[PDB]
Amino acid sequence: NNKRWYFTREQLENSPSRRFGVDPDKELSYRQQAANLLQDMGQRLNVSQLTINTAIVYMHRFYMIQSFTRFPGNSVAPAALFLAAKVEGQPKKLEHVIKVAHTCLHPQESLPDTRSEAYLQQVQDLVILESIILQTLGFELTIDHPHTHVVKCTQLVRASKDLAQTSYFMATNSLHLTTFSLQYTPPVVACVCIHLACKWSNWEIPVSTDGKHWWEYVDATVTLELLDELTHELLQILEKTPNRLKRIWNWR
Amino acid sequence: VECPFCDEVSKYEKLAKIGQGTFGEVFKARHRKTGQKVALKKVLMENEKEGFPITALREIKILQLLKHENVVNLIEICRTGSIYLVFDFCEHDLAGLLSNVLVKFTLSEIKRVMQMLLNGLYYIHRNKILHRDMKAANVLITRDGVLKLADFGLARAFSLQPNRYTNRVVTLWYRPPELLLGERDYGPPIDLWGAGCIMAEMWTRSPIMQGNTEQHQLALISQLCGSITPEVWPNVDNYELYEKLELVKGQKRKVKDRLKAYVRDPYALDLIDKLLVLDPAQRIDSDDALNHDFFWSDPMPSDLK
Ligand SMILES: Nc1n[nH]c(N)c1/N=N/c1ccc(O)cc1
Known part of the structure; x- marks a missing residue:
């Protein structure tokens, strides 16, 4: 429905994973870890960030229903990406995804003979898992991403290519590092992204002639008290993430 | 394994093929509790060796989008392993x-x-x-x-x-x-x-x-x-x-x-x-x-x- 995949804070704390004794902080790592695995595979498999993001969202929702203690991120992530790639028009072959997921989780090991049975199984497992992801998501595989609205947000502030790129950066990273995709609609997340991208670049946008703030043309429900509340949380976890801010840090 | 958003198609009583001759494998069926009539399309998996068929993903994407008095209506998708598309029934x-x-x-x-x-x-x-x-x-x-x-x-x-x-x-x-x-x-x-x-x-x-x-x-x-x-x-x-x-x-x-x-x-x-x-x-x-x-x-x- 319209609110089936959006949760409260009280709901995120009482996650399926919490119910099996996984601390609140570990669940978050577990998520981030899956995100990273998706990104690493996604780049080797030569698919788009759009696909990777769709996969990351599948993974997020999936773990609002299933628990990490029954489905390990390193199993779900590849199946999730296998699915996203089909959905977003960039299908990758089942054997191709297994191949890549392997060298990602086992940089050292060598790929079993694609004739063995221990391989024929890990192929059946992926397929099985993709089925479980579909059923879990109830076949809602059409995902809206904050990125879509970033153009529309940054078009307003007439920001440089630079503030734009940075805003997308914030977008993608919010998917990796936070559970925003589970709490706030894309257009709101998009605002949070631009807002923080501005703070970071020191960019300041003047109030318009109407007297309205830049973000009211984006979502009726967005308020400065929220943007500051969110961009703080987002910035915090970005500071905890090694080498991440460096990518948008002005070194001049 | 939990599954709150994909009901078992066993909630529908099959009735008759209507039919395979129309290019798809479609049954008529009756909601065991309300009598509601529906059409079940099974997603055929013969000769599909790449997981859930990309073909069926398109269709489901499209039907979930197309909501209109003159377009057939997808109600939900059901499981059993096998997957069923379920529509409002058209006589x-x-x-x-x-x-x-x-x-x-x-x-x-x-x-x-x-x-x-x-x-x-x-x-x-x-x-x-x-x-x-x-x-x-x-x-x-x-x-x-x-x-x-x-x-x-x-x-x-x-x-x-x-x-x-x-x-x-x-x-x-x-x-x-x-x-x-x-x-x-x-x-x-x-x-x-x-x-x-x-x-x-x-x-x-x-x-x-x-x-x-x-x-x-x-x-x-x-x-x-x-x-x-x-x-x-x-x-x-x-x-x-x-x-x-x-x-x-x-x-x-x-x-x-x-x-x-x-x-x-x-x-x-x-x-x-x-x-x-x-x-x-x-x-x-x-x-x-x-x-x-x-x-x-x-x-x-x-x-x-
Ligand atoms: N709803 C229906 N009643 N009787 C049918 N043959 C029937 N067919 N429905 C379909 C059949 C195929 C399809 O891709 C989508 C809907």
């Missing part, structure tokens, strides 16, 4: 009706049918979807007399380095000239061609251009709509398959004449002629056809009984 298919001899259509009812059909097409096109499988058999009608377009199996989104859409689409009999001349940059106008054939079928009770091969199809189309001259269809040259294979040369348009006997109504014939136009860029669109004097003269479009 009739326009082909079963047209072949049944005890069934009889008044001009006003036919108006209504075409209206719904064309209105349904307007919606999907507006939503950037091509049906690509127009045929009487794919036009359903509910017991309360509402028409629904169905079977979005070969369906596909379209948009605007020309396009490279699949060319092997549309049943041969309802396939337009563009696709027989090997076109790969098409759009809405193809579905409307089918709308044409279907409309004609409404008086002739039988598909009007039943070819054996693609060259035989283009053959029949010319004997009815005229030859494929750049006089009629500007730039029909650039198509390699143009001269490469047959075609005629002396054919003059016999659409109105050949159908005259069956159709009768002048406005009816007039609309059929603008639907069965050779050049897609000149073939009437769904908006203008809904506005054609056919639907705004007597008798007026009436409900179905």
Whole structure:
């Protein structure tokens, strides 16, 4: 429905994973870890960030229903990406995804003979898992991403290519590092992204002639008290993430 | 393993195949608790070696988007392992009706049918979807007399380095000239061609251009709509398959004449002629056809009984 995949804070704390004794902080790592695995595979498999993001969202929702203690991120992530790639028009072959997921989780090991049975199984497992992801998501595989609205947000502030790129950066990273995709609609997340991208670049946008703030043309429900509340949380976890801010840090 | 958003299809009591002959494996079924009638399409997994079929993902994507009085309605998706698409049930298919001899259509009812059909097409096109499988058999009608377009199996989104859409689409009999001349940059106008054939079928009770091969199809189309001259269809040259294979040369348009006997109504014939136009860029669109004097003269479009 319209609110089936959006949760409260009280709901995120009482996650399926919490119910099996996984601390609140570990669940978050577990998520981030899956995100990273998706990104690493996604780049080797030569698919788009759009696909990777769709996969990351599948993974997020999936773990609002299933628990990490029954489905390990390193199993779900590849199946999730296998699915996203089909959905977003960039299908990758089942054997191709297994191949890549392997060298990602086992940089050292060598790929079993694609004739063995221990391989024929890990192929059946992926397929099985993709089925479980579909059923879990109830076949809602059409995902809206904050990125879509970033153009529309940054078009307003007439920001440089630079503030734009940075805003997308914030977008993608919010998917990796936070559970925003589970709490706030894309257009709101998009605002949070631009807002923080501005703070970071020191960019300041003047109030318009109407007297309205830049973000009211984006979502009726967005308020400065929220943007500051969110961009703080987002910035915090970005500071905890090694080498991440460096990518948008002005070194001049 | 938990599953709050995908019910076991066992909640539906199967009844009868309706049917495999329509290109899909479809059952009628009854909600064990409410009696609600539904159609279950199984997702066929024979010869599928790449997980859940990308084909079925398209269809489900499209149906979840297409919500409209004249488009079949996906209610939910069910499991059991196997996966089922579940629709609101449609008692009739326009082909079963047209072949049944005890069934009889008044001009006003036919108006209504075409209206719904064309209105349904307007919606999907507006939503950037091509049906690509127009045929009487794919036009359903509910017991309360509402028409629904169905079977979005070969369906596909379209948009605007020309396009490279699949060319092997549309049943041969309802396939337009563009696709027989090997076109790969098409759009809405193809579905409307089918709308044409279907409309004609409404008086002739039988598909009007039943070819054996693609060259035989283009053959029949010319004997009815005229030859494929750049006089009629500007730039029909650039198509390699143009001269490469047959075609005629002396054919003059016999659409109105050949159908005259069956159709009768002048406005009816007039609309059929603008639907069965050779050049897609000149073939009437769904908006203008809904506005054609056919639907705004007597008798007026009436409900179905
Ligand atoms: N709803 C229905 N009632 N009776 C049918 N044959 C019927 N078919 N529905 C379909 C069939 C195929 C499809 O891709 C989508 C809907």
